[PDB]
């Protein structure tokens, strides 16, 4: 359905400082976006910034006391909406994808954030895939562990054989696209 | 005198701390095994040029040279600089002083500061004026030279003062030697540790090999050939219509227009008023002179891409330079149709191709030969000699595929915009190329997860292995799994996952299907195939014996089974060796997975060079909206987003169309997957060369990293033996021929025998049939039947 | 819904470029009637470079899009091509191909775009156990079976086939000597 987003709560003119939240940090003209957490990289006393492989800004240095605080940006992804038809109900259930729950029946999975849902805990087999193991499905929306499949132990001793004693012929359809339409511009 | 500065010299380019990275930059420095001038101090200080900034050594042992003096004429008419430093107090000024004649320490101002054994190493550089200085002290235990060691330095003093410097001069102390270098633009290729502190570098317009290791980004490179840059002829002068040469690259101008090549003349149809002759794209072949009349055609300098022969960085260190489509006669110089050949030697030997040079050349000291294709022999045919197999080698080959990728999506408001207004006000102006983007990405990753499906979902009833392995003698324990693990797999798996190994928009979504599910449905597939057979694929299991199992298989390979029931033993050693050879290889050799290392490294390439693209400037004045938007007015502001929109725009879908051309490659490779999987896994294939080299027997998969792996057992005959032969046998007149397989001879004797492994048997009326007269067929042989 | 999948595509593409010629890819309108009416043709001619630019790319898109497409379409045809021949035209034994089960006929019938095969597929539903051996011993030389398994039924020892039950009496015509008892794990002592 759309994108989410953490937003922001003040921005930070280098006034005071504060830490472990999304803020706005304005150091002498430049501005970004993340959380100014304090880090104990190595500080040559040269050096003002901490860049990875792909140079953007990870690392800073405050211009008033010697410390650094390395920068970690406001958490995001995709909203994400699970539906039955409208003819059988209404429901709906709110994934939010990579992104903890502490940042929103409350349900956390490694694939994200799973609100709407419940959590049984038998097997069945898969109906909406959810992602990372787990797949959707008396209104109640619920949330599982799939079910790859029925469980069997083939009798297998040394003198054992199988031979079956009557057939089923069966008929299976097969589907191939051959063509789109023909068409010029 | 004069001596060779072997690396020292190199300081800290940007304040800007990495950690555990190679980083390329450029910018002015001493180039590496380069002379620099040595002094001397018993029994010395002119006045040394400053052209581009000086790298200055002094090993003291009684701190003799202290000071600088710093201008362009020293006579005090120009702003000079003047240090002085008596070991505890550092002096700089900027003042205008009269010096003296040869100045030494003897034992308008509007800037101050004050505050063998050793090595005292500086950079006194300039950029724009703006004087810097380098330093590093450290002690050593040398009396003659300079030691051969590298040592970074870090900036110590910045100054503004905007001073253009020709002149310097030391300062002794009257009652340890110095060096002098200059800097060239080269460019480096550092290499920083965890604590922020460089440890090495490399000079990239030294050597060959240098070149090489510049272009690909590291210090160890692997056997192969990697292009460095491209040839390039030069011309030497410019003909002005002046005179007029031929046969050279020279520089021509007539009446205003340009150009480059070679002015030899030629005999052109001139037709009295026409000049010129023209190629395709508005280039000249001809061209004639207004001096007078000629008329002379043009061919353009000489050009190629060279490349570089380099062997294993663990063996050697010697290259090999060869130029493409360039005669040796305007570069142990070796000429080949691929090109020069400059740094091996020719070789009149042939033998198996190591690096392939290109029309038949293969190099391998360092050496240039013709390829060997292969082995010689010449089949002893005739009109009646046979060869039939005697013992046969049960074989195991591994083979790789790869069935998928990681699910990736790029929201373009994200990409393009940073958390802004006006870039999305823009990017909403140019219509409906997101949501198409995300479309195609959206796509990608659903088929993706299809592919994985297709591949490995195909028994839906996951089976258990018995706990008694009664196999027949066989054994299945380094492939079946172990339930020690806390993440459930088996011993070869664990091999295969120990090999192989942001903040922008750019998400990674996970797989639907977990890697201990994958690996149920791999050891439901197996166990399925140990304890059931084929049957397992058509409807329902069954229950097979296993030596019953494998001796239908040998019936679908010609050989009767009787063979595997009495040599079970010898079979069942053999493959217990050669998985056992499985694993040694998987655990000493890393080549083996290079197909799914290279779908790894591609897709991280791909996404890296996305993200650098995120740098470009795409011709804007910035290329970051931050600081774009803090400085413009919004008139002016709106043509550089849109600049800079049209970049990423242009960067994201060539990204998503290589992802598509890629995507459609795996789709293939997934689709060649599951067709394997049902032809060899679950069954008996027939199409030779498909499930393995020989006769096939067997298949057994493993998962691995976004991909597959097989095991392809497979009979393969190994002894022979020769035989005559004949295509008939007459007896009273009429024709015998044989059911199934050769009829055969030892030499005294005739017998009958399976075609494909050496069991003779006696002619009877049960194993020939009578068909036809004698006169018909060429080549009866008469013998009691 | 493959099918329907491939013409909803199709059709949603060729309705993305109608609504790109609704766009305006930056300039002040969308119409070149309503651009050359009013304008100059000195930012005129800078406008239509916009809309030129902004189109051109577009159908660029679309084409590469196609070209992707119909590549997918063309491996399908073949694939298509090969089954019709393989399956249609002849009884396969590459498993799994023709339909899941011994693939023993197909039938084509024509579709929007398309064809339809209708797999007829053997396939055997109802199982026994039986006791095994892997040869037969009778006089010291062992017997092993040309075509299919050795069963028994608890008293008497039995021949069939592999595929479905149907079994007959030891004799010599479906049974060959091949040498020595001893080398064979599993034998056992009926009359041949």
């Given at each position: 359905?759309?994108?989410?987003?953490?937003?922001?709560?003040?921005?930070?003119?280098?006034?005071?400082?504060?830490?472990?939240?999304?803020?706005?940090?304005?150091?002498?003209?430049?501005?970004?976006?993340?959380?100014?957490?304090?880090?104990?990289?190595?500080?040559?006393?040269?050096?003002?910034?901490?860049?990875?492989?792909?140079?953007?800004?990870?690392?800073?240095?405050?211009?008033?006391?010697?410390?650094?605080?390395?920068?970690?940006?406001?958490?995001?992804?995709?909203?994400?909406?699970?539906?039955?038809?409208?003819?059988?109900?209404?429901?709906?259930?709110?994934?939010?994808?990579?992104?903890?729950?502490?940042?929103?029946?409350?349900?956390?999975?490694?694939?994200?954030?799973?609100?709407?849902?419940?959590?049984?805990?038998?097997?069945?087999?898969?109906?909406?895939?959810?992602?990372?193991?787990?797949?959707?499905?008396?209104?109640?929306?619920?949330?599982?562990?799939?079910?790859?499949?029925?469980?069997?132990?083939?009798?297998?001793?040394?003198?054992?054989?199988?031979?079956?004693?009557?057939?089923?012929?069966?008929?299976?359809?097969?589907?191939?696209?051959?063509?789109?339409?023909?068409?010029?511009? | 005198?004069?001596?060779?500065?072997?690396?020292?010299?190199?300081?800290?380019?940007?304040?800007?701390?990495?950690?555990?990275?190679?980083?390329?930059?450029?910018?002015?420095?001493?180039?590496?095994?380069?002379?620099?001038?040595?002094?001397?101090?018993?029994?010395?200080?002119?006045?040394?040029?400053?052209?581009?900034?000086?790298?200055?050594?002094?090993?003291?042992?009684?701190?003799?040279?202290?000071?600088?003096?710093?201008?362009?004429?020293?006579?005090?008419?120009?702003?000079?600089?003047?240090?002085?430093?008596?070991?505890?107090?550092?002096?700089?000024?900027?003042?205008?002083?009269?010096?003296?004649?040869?100045?030494?320490?003897?034992?308008?101002?509007?800037?101050?500061?004050?505050?063998?054994?050793?090595?005292?190493?500086?950079?006194?550089?300039?950029?724009?004026?703006?004087?810097?200085?380098?330093?590093?002290?450290?002690?050593?235990?040398?009396?003659?030279?300079?030691?051969?060691?590298?040592?970074?330095?870090?900036?110590?003093?910045?100054?503004?003062?905007?001073?253009?410097?020709?002149?310097?001069?030391?300062?002794?102390?009257?009652?340890?030697?110095?060096?002098?270098?200059?800097?060239?633009?080269?460019?480096?290729?550092?290499?920083?540790?965890?604590?922020?502190?460089?440890?090495?570098?490399?000079?990239?317009?030294?050597?060959?090999?240098?070149?090489?290791?510049?272009?690909?980004?590291?210090?160890?490179?692997?056997?192969?050939?990697?292009?460095?840059?491209?040839?390039?002829?030069?011309?030497?002068?410019?003909?002005?219509?002046?005179?007029?040469?031929?046969?050279?690259?020279?520089?021509?101008?007539?009446?205003?227009?340009?150009?480059?090549?070679?002015?030899?003349?030629?005999?052109?149809?001139?037709?009295?008023?026409?000049?010129?002759?023209?190629?395709?794209?508005?280039?000249?072949?001809?061209?004639?002179?207004?001096?007078?009349?000629?008329?002379?055609?043009?061919?353009?300098?000489?050009?190629?891409?060279?490349?570089?022969?380099?062997?294993?960085?663990?063996?050697?260190?010697?290259?090999?330079?060869?130029?493409?489509?360039?005669?040796?006669?305007?570069?142990?110089?070796?000429?080949?149709?691929?090109?020069?050949?400059?740094?091996?030697?020719?070789?009149?030997?042939?033998?198996?191709?190591?690096?392939?040079?290109?029309?038949?050349?293969?190099?391998?000291?360092?050496?240039?030969?013709?390829?060997?294709?292969?082995?010689?022999?010449?089949?002893?045919?005739?009109?009646?000699?046979?060869?039939?197999?005697?013992?046969?080698?049960?074989?195991?080959?591994?083979?790789?595929?790869?069935?998928?990728?990681?699910?990736?999506?790029?929201?373009?408001?994200?990409?393009?915009?940073?958390?802004?207004?006006?870039?999305?006000?823009?990017?909403?102006?140019?219509?409906?190329?997101?949501?198409?983007?995300?479309?195609?990405?959206?796509?990608?990753?659903?088929?993706?997860?299809?592919?994985?499906?297709?591949?490995?979902?195909?028994?839906?009833?996951?089976?258990?292995?018995?706990?008694?392995?009664?196999?027949?003698?066989?054994?299945?324990?380094?492939?079946?799994?172990?339930?020690?693990?806390?993440?459930?797999?088996?011993?070869?798996?664990?091999?295969?996952?120990?090999?192989?190994?942001?903040?922008?928009?750019?998400?990674?979504?996970?797989?639907?299907?977990?890697?201990?599910?994958?690996?149920?449905?791999?050891?439901?597939?197996?166990?399925?195939?140990?304890?059931?057979?084929?049957?397992?694929?058509?409807?329902?299991?069954?229950?097979?014996?296993?030596?019953?199992?494998?001796?239908?298989?040998?019936?679908?390979?010609?050989?009767?089974?009787?063979?595997?029931?009495?040599?079970?033993?010898?079979?069942?050693?053999?493959?217990?060796?050669?998985?056992?050879?499985?694993?040694?290889?998987?655990?000493?050799?890393?080549?083996?997975?290079?197909?799914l290392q290279d779908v790894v490294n591609q897709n991280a390439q791909a996404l890296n060079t996305l993200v650098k693209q995120l740098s470009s400037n795409f011709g804007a004045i910035s290329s970051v909206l931050n600081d774009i938007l803090s400085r413009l007015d919004p008139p002016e502001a709106e043509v550089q987003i849109d600049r800079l929109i049209t970049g990423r725009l242009q960067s994201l879908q060539t990204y998503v169309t290589q992802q598509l051309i890629r995507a459609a490659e795996i789709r293939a490779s997934a689709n060649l997957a599951a067709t394997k999987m049902s032809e060899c896994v679950l069954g008996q294939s027939k199409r030779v060369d498909f499930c393995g080299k020989g006769?096939?027997?067997?298949?057994?998969?493993?998962?691995?990293?976004?991909?597959?792996?097989?095991?392809?057992?497979?009979?393969?005959?190994?002894?022979?033996?020769?035989?005559?032969?004949?295509?008939?046998?007459?007896?009273?007149?009429?024709?015998?021929?044989?059911?199934?397989?050769?009829?055969?001879?030892?030499?005294?004797?005739?017998?009958?025998?399976?075609?494909?492994?050496?069991?003779?048997?006696?002619?009877?009326?049960?194993?020939?049939?009578?068909?036809?007269?004698?006169?018909?067929?060429?080549?009866?042989?008469?013998?009691?039947?």
């Amino acid at each position: 359905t759309s994108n989410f987003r953490v937003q922001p709560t003040e921005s930070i003119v280098r006034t005071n400082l504060v830490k472990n939240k999304c803020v706005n940090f304005n150091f002498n003209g430049l501005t970004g976006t993340g959380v100014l957490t304090e880090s104990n990289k190595k500080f040559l006393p040269f050096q003002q910034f901490g860049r990875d492989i792909a140079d953007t800004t990870d690392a800073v240095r405050d211009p008033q006391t010697l410390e650094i605080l390395d920068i970690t940006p406001c958490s995001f992804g995709g909203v994400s909406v699970i539906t039955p038809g409208t003819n059988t109900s209404n429901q709906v259930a709110v994934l939010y994808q990579g992104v903890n729950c502490t940042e929103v029946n409350v349900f956390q999975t490694r694939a994200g954030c799973l609100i709407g849902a419940e959590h049984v805990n038998n097997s069945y087999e898969c109906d909406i895939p959810i992602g990372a193991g787990i797949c959707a499905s008396s209104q109640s929306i619920i949330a599982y562990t799939m079910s790859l499949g029925a469980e069997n132990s083939v009798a297998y001793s040394n003198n054992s054989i199988a031979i079956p004693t009557n057939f089923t012929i069966s008929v299976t359809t097969e589907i191939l696209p051959v063509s789109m339409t023909k068409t010029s511009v | 005198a004069y001596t060779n500065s072997f690396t020292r010299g190199v300081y800290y380019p940007d304040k800007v701390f990495r950690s555990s990275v190679l980083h390329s930059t450029q910018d002015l420095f001493l180039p590496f095994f380069s002379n620099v001038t040595w002094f001397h101090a018993i029994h010395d200080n002119p006045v040394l040029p400053f052209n581009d900034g000086v790298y200055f050594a002094s090993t003291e042992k009684s701190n003799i040279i202290r000071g600088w003096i710093f201008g362009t004429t020293l006579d005090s008419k120009t702003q000079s600089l003047l240090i002085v430093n008596n070991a505890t107090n550092v002096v700089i000024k900027v003042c205008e002083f009269q010096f003296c004649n040869d100045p030494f320490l003897g034992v308008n101002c509007t800037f101050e500061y004050v505050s063998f054994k050793n090595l005292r190493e500086f950079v006194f550089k300039n950029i724009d004026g703006y004087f810097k200085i380098y330093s590093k002290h450290t002690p050593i235990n040398l009396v003659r030279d300079l030691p051969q060691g590298f040592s970074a330095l870090e900036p110590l003093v910045d100054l503004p003062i905007g001073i253009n410097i020709t002149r310097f001069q030391t300062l002794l102390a009257l009652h340890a030697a110095y060096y002098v270098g200059y800097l060239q633009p080269r460019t480096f290729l550092l290499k920083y540790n965890e604590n922020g502190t460089i440890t090495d570098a490399v000079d990239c317009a030294l050597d060959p090999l240098s070149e090489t290791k510049c272009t690909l980004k590291s210090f160890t490179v692997e056997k192969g050939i990697y292009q460095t840059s491209n040839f390039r002829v030069q011309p030497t002068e410019s003909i002005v219509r002046t005179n007029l040469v031929k046969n050279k690259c020279v520089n021509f101008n007539f009446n205003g227009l340009t150009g480059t090549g070679v002015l030899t003349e030629s005999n052109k149809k001139f037709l009295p008023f026409q000049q010129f002759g023209r190629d395709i794209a508005d280039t000249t072949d001809a061209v004639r002179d207004p001096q007078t009349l000629e008329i002379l055609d043009i061919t353009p300098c000489s050009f190629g891409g060279v490349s570089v022969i380099t062997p294993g960085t663990n063996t050697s260190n010697q290259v090999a330079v060869l130029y493409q489509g360039v005669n040796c006669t305007e570069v142990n110089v070796f000429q080949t149709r691929a090109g020069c050949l400059i740094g091996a030697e020719h070789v009149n030997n042939s033998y198996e191709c190591d690096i392939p040079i290109g029309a038949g050349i293969c190099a391998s000291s360092i050496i240039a030969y013709t390829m060997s294709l292969g082995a010689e022999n010449s089949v002893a045919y005739s009109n009646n000699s046979i060869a039939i197999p005697t013992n046969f080698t049960i074989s195991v080959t591994t083979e790789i595929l790869p069935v998928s990728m990681t699910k990736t999506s790029v929201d373009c408001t994200m990409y393009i915009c940073g958390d802004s207004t006006e870039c999305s006000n823009l990017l909403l102006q140019y219509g409906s190329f997101c949501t198409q983007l995300n479309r195609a990405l959206t796509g990608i990753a659903v088929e993706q997860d299809k592919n994985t499906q297709e591949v490995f979902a195909q028994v839906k009833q996951i089976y258990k292995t018995p706990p008694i392995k009664d196999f027949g003698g066989f054994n299945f324990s380094q492939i079946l799994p172990d339930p020690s693990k806390p993440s459930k797999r088996s011993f070869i798996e664990d091999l295969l996952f120990n090999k192989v190994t942001k903040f922008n928009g750019l998400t990674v979504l996970p797989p639907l299907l977990t890697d201990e599910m994958i690996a149920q449905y791999t050891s439901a597939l197996l166990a399925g195939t140990i304890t059931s057979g084929w049957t397992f694929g058509a409807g329902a299991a069954l229950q097979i014996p296993f030596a019953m199992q494998m001796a239908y298989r040998f019936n679908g390979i010609g050989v009767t089974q009787n063979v595997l029931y009495e040599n079970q033993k010898l079979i069942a050693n053999q493959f217990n060796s050669a998985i056992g050879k499985i694993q040694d290889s998987l655990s000493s050799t890393a080549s083996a997975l290079g197909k799914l290392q290279d779908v790894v490294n591609q897709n991280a390439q791909a996404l890296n060079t996305l993200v650098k693209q995120l740098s470009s400037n795409f011709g804007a004045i910035s290329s970051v909206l931050n600081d774009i938007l803090s400085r413009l007015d919004p008139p002016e502001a709106e043509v550089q987003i849109d600049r800079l929109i049209t970049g990423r725009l242009q960067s994201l879908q060539t990204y998503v169309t290589q992802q598509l051309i890629r995507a459609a490659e795996i789709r293939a490779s997934a689709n060649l997957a599951a067709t394997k999987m049902s032809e060899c896994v679950l069954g008996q294939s027939k199409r030779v060369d498909f499930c393995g080299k020989g006769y096939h027997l067997m298949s057994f998969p493993q998962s691995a990293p976004h991909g597959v792996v097989f095991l392809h057992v497979t009979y393969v005959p190994a002894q022979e033996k020769n035989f005559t032969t004949a295509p008939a046998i007459c007896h009273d007149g009429k024709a015998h021929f044989p059911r199934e397989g050769v009829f055969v001879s030892n030499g005294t004797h005739w017998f009958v025998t399976q075609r494909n492994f050496y069991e003779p048997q006696i002619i009877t009326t049960d194993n020939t049939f009578v068909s036809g007269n004698c006169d018909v067929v060429i080549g009866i042989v008469n013998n009691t039947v």
